Design a protein around this ligand. Structure first.
Ligand code: A1AL4
Length: 166
């Protein structure tokens, strides 16, 4: 958990302008959060990048989990191996509001982070899922009580978040 160059936003929320994959390789955190979908099909975004950095080992393990357990629910999670990136990967499903899923489930999604003392994570429900990323950071700050290190890859978004927050 050797995090460096983060800006502290609250007592338990830190932020850095970085690619979450590069952070995972350097830090080797106990937990890396994936912004997953209910079938754990890691096709793009954070999920595609984390899976690519495991050389598809994350996808093979995710397919076996879905065969035995079935899909996750929106707002839910599962803990699987972190492979070469972390001890564990916490796969979390935020609502896709562009497909009618309720924005109140974004609070349920961030509540999963509270089972882990320290996490490396992206913002949930942003991008193709349609939630406003500044609103997603406000839900994170109001829901997560354990120590979260947020990696924001787009510098333009990182600057908007830091301006809106502090
Ligand atoms: C569907 O769920 C999401 C949830 C996060 C997002 C976007 N995050 C990423 O795609 C991302 N974040 C950190 N490291 C990364 N490495 C490769 C991709 C990547 C949001 C918009 C964003 N942009 N810049 N920082 N965060 C897109 C969709």
């Amino acid at each position: 958990n050797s995090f460096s160059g983060y800006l502290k936003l609250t007592d338990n929320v830190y932020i850095k302008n970085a690619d979450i994959v590069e952070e995972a390789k350097k830090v080797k955190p106990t937990v890396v959060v994936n912004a997953a979908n209910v079938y754990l099909k890691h096709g793009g975004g954070v999920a595609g990048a984390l899976n690519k950095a495991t050389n598809n080992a994350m996808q093979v393990e995710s397919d076996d989990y879905i065969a035995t357990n079935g899909p996750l629910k929106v707002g839910g999670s599962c803990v699987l191996s972190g492979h070469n990136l972390a001890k564990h990967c916490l796969h979390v499903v935020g609502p896709n509001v562009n497909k009618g899923e309720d924005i109140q489930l974004l609070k349920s999604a961030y509540e999963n982070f509270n089972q882990h003392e320290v996490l490396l994570a992206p913002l949930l429900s942003a991008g193709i899922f349609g939630a406003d990323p500044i609103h997603s950071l406000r839900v994170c700050v109001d829901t997560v009580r354990t120590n979260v290190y947020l990696a924001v890859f787009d510098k333009n978004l990182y600057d908007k978040l830091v301006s809106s927050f502090l």
